[PDB]
Amino acid sequence: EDRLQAVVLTDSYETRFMPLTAVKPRCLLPLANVPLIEYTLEFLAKAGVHEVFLICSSHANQINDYIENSKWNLPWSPFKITTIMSPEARCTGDVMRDLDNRGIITGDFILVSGDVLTNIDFSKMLEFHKKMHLQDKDHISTMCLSKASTYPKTRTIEPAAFVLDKSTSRCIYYQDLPLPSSREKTSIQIDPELLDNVDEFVIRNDLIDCRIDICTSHVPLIFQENFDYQSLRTDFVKGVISSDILGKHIYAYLTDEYAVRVESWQTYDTISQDFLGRWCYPLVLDSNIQDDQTYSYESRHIYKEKDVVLAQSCKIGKCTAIGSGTKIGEGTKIENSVIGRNCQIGENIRIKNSFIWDDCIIGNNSIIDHSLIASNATLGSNVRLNDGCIIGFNVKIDDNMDLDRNTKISASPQDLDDQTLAVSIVGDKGV
């Protein structure tokens, strides 16, 4: 039950964020107006940590600085942050190998890939895991899966068709399909290797990725043994099914309450929206986590920090949130959009269903629809943006532009159109 170490895969899913992640590390980017790492840390604490470990890689100095800044740094914390520093660029097998080389591995150690923030109480889960362990020697690792709104629709990267058990809760098949977006390989398989032993076959698909694992003493040794598992989902579960290490059990925890991990950009937006609303049991910003935070709760699902001002006569839809150091002008038509920290507003702006990051000037006469504006990137006069316009680092949107739907703009100070220098591409400008 007690004494459990935390190991979290950081600096791993870079470039999966299609424009971002190159100069500053993946996790250091400001999520919901305040750093992503903190939420994850809090979650870990809630679960039950005794020492914090992250597998940092991309530019370690900044990570070190962050650690220095952080609250877990000085004596008062039950757990300190001392990140594992390794050679540059390596996969999850390689990461595991590195960890093994380093040495600090325990019995019931915790392994979470990427960054996650959800509500479900973990103590019960832990207890269940322990019980399972107490049953037989062959039990391995824990899966986290949650139910969704009947039919799948906003799921293409990970629409896993889980064939599952009710009596023992154990996986039978795993498949990722591009069927809702590109109808080319519509395929479902039922393997016969565990067919005439289970009998209670349940065919399901409507479940969401969390990538949170409680790992026993078997896992790192297994990793060390088999160099074919460079990944952890598509190869691993299949291998387990196939009985590479013969006759072993895996758990599939099924919860009625909502649980999703961080993956893409629309998904990120959805997560943010959820956080803003009361979709997960207690999660709030107004409670204040990181030192200098001065957040306060308001009615009509509205979040306001201190040093926050919005002016009179703004007839609005529903749900708005503002960061600190913000001055908002007069006469605006707004529906379900979010404005970040130290963002300035002149006059006359229409906004619908949006999220805005750190220090982004919403210029005079501008429309933001389902589109993001990132750190130091600013909007000037007469910009007409549409649904899903992704903006990265230092995109200085200056004078007169019209960008179409689903357009992606490059970040780091290359592969995709529209660049960092003055005005985004409508009339060719750059180097």
Binding site: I190, D199, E200, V202, I203, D206
Partner: protein, 375 residues
């Protein structure tokens, strides 16, 4: 609009009992009572007048004779013999032949039935959802290998895949367009269809447009997949058959059922051993031989002993009887255990009073008074 179909024929698929041309299958004396008694009872419960009976090429009078013999119904049954079938298929060939005479929705029941489950509630359910087809499923025994395809989905209760396995394919074969919709399917490895069918008017014109009929199970309900493209016009809710789960035992005989049924029977059931006078109020009753009983008798979960006479209006609610008892004129009972020699009656509504040995009941009131032996 209201009509019932009764199917009755001959069996040859079974291993044993059947050899001569004189004895078919309609008049089987396995254990005193005939096979069709249950069916008759069901019909009585249903209450119907215009019921059509069907027969194949062989035996034209013997079945009629059987129907006549022993006999309550006293209605008007009608039987027809169209001669085109040569035993290859059960009633599809008959259905194809007779179509404009059908008034509306119809209830189909074959001769091979043993029932213990509630009756008209299937019919009512059918009426309710207002769909094309309905069938039921029954579990396998717990007392002393893979069998056949059965899948369920409910939130409402419906059927997705029904195609049987005799020439069984190694992998489980279905459709993914029938999986993308309904994303919480379950494969069952216990179920068995027991020849219960309920159908509607709309499927009477499609048989003449396109003949597809196979064995009344291979194709009778199979067109349900309405996905991808579709290249057939609909006749004027999606065209889907339904499946409903049950608990109590109501099995079928087709491959391996002849010895187990007898065991199930004799050990429980509706008991008859002596002369009876018989619509009646009180479900599930246990009656003994040598006695003489009258009408309007009320029994609520009660087992009698050797010789127990009931005369002129009685209401019994949880009472057990032991050797030799007399009952005459007006008895109402609530929670009693009775011993030897008892003459209970004298008009009373007694609750929580036990009767001991050698006593005649007087018309008097006594609260918490245990019926003691002698004063």
């Amino acid at each position: 609009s209201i009509q019932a179909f009764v199917f009755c024929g001959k069996g040859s698929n079974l291993a044993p009992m059947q050899h001569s041309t004189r004895l078919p299958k309609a008049l089987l004396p396995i254990g005193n009572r005939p096979m069709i008694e249950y069916v008759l009872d069901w019909c009585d419960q249903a209450d119907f007048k215009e019921i059509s009976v069907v027969a194949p090429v062989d035996e034209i009078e013997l079945i009629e004779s059987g129907l006549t013999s022993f006999l309550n119904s006293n209605h008007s049954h009608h039987l027809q013999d169209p001669k085109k079938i040569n035993f290859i298929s059960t009633g599809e060939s008959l259905q194809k032949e007779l179509l404009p005479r059908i008034n509306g929705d119809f209830v189909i029941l074959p001769c091979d039935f043993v029932t213990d489950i509630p009756p008209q509630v299937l019919v009512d359910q059918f009426r309710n959802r207002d769909d094309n087809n309905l069938a039921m499923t029954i579990y396998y025994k717990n007392s002393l290998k893979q069998q056949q395809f059965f899948t369920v989905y409910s939130e409402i209760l419906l059927d997705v895949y029904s195609q049987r396995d005799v020439t069984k394919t190694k992998y489980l074969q279905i459709r993914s367009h029938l999986l993308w919709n309904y994303p919480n399917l379950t494969v069952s490895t216990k179920l068995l269809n027991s020849f219960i069918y309920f159908c509607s008017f709309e499927l009477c014109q499609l048989l003449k447009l396109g003949p597809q009929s196979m064995s009344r199970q291979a194709s009778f309900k199979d067109p349900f997949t309405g996905n991808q493209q579709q290249q057939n016009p609909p006749t004027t809710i999606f065209i889907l058959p339904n499946e409903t789960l049950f608990i109590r035992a109501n099995n079928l005989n087709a491959y391996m059922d002849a010895n187990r049924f007898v065991l199930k029977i004799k050990s429980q059931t509706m008991f008859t051993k002596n002369i009876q006078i018989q619509a009646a109020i009180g479900a599930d009753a246990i009656v003994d031989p040598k006695c003489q009983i009258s009408a309007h008798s009320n029994v609520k979960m009660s087992v009698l002993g050797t010789q127990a006479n009931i005369g002129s209006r009685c209401r019994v609610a949880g009472s057990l009887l032991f050797p030799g008892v007399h009952l005459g004129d007006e008895v109402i009972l609530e929670n009693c255990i009775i011993g030897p020699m008892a003459k209970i009656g004298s008009k009373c509504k007694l609750s929580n009073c036990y009767i001991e040995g050698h006593y005649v009941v007087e018309p008097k009131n006594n609260f918490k008074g245990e019926t003691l032996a002698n004063v």
